[PDB]
C-alpha cells in the first residue's frame, strides 16, 4: 500500500529509514512496516532506527506477528505500525 512498506532484502536498514522519513516530510502520519522471513529482523531494525532518530516523535502503535500462506507454504511475518506524534 501507499502506507504499508514491505521491507526488502536488497535495501539496507538506513535505505528504509529514509523512505519513511521522506513520507513523514510529505505529511504522511502513519506507516506499517512489514517483514517476512529473514526480513523480519530488518523490519525491527528499521523501527528501532526510526525510534533512535525521532525518539518520542514516533510511536509504535502496534506490533503483531503471524503467518501467511503462499503456494501452500507457511511464511512468518511481523507488522510494526508507526505513528507521529506532534
Amino acid at each position: 500500500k501507499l502506507n504499508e512498506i514491505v521491507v526488502r532484502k536488497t535495501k539496507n536498514v538506513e535505505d528504509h529509514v529514509l523512505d519513511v522519513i521522506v513520507l513523514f516530510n510529505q505529511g504522511i502520519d502513519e506507516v506499517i512496516l512489514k517483514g517476512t522471513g529473514r526480513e523480519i529482523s530488518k523490519a525491527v531494525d528499521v523501527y528501532n532506527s526510526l525510534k533512535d532518530r525521532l525518539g518520542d516523535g514516533v510511536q509504535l502503535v502496534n506490533v503483531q506477528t503471524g503467518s501467511e500462506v503462499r503456494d501452500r507454504r507457511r511464511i512468518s511475518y511481523i507488522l510494526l505500525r508507526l505513528k507521529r506524534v506532534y
Binding site: 522471513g37 525491527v44 523501527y47
Partner: protein
C-alpha cells in the same frame, strides 16, 4: 530457564526446546533473540502455534528493544532485540 534463546542452530532445534518446556508443564515461556536471530525467534513461535499446537497457544507479550553495545576496547554498536512471551490458552 523458561527462556529459549535463539542462536545459529536450525529453527527446529528451538521449536523442540519450546515444545519441551511447554510439555513439562511450564505455564509461560519466552523466546528471545538479538540481531538477525530475531527472524528465527518469530518463526519459532509461528511454527509452535501453527504446526504443533494449533488452537492452544497465545502470545501474551511482544517486547521490541534496542541496545547500545559498548566493548572493553571502546567499540560500540546498536543491536535490536525481541522477546515473545507465549502461554497455553
Amino acid at each position: 530457564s523458561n527462556v529459549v534463546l535463539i542462536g545459529k542452530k536450525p529453527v527446529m532445534n528451538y521449536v523442540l526446546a519450546a515444545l519441551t518446556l511447554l510439555n513439562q508443564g511450564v505455564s509461560e515461556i519466552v523466546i528471545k533473540a538479538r540481531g538477525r536471530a530475531i527472524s528465527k525467534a518469530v518463526d519459532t513461535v509461528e511454527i509452535v502455534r501453527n504446526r504443533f499446537l494449533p488452537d492452544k497457544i497465545e502470545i501474551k507479550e511482544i517486547r521490541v528493544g534496542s541496545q547500545v553495545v559498548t566493548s572493553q576496547d571502546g567499540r560500540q554498536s546498536r543491536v535490536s532485540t525481541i522477546e515473545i512471551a507465549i502461554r497455553k490458552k
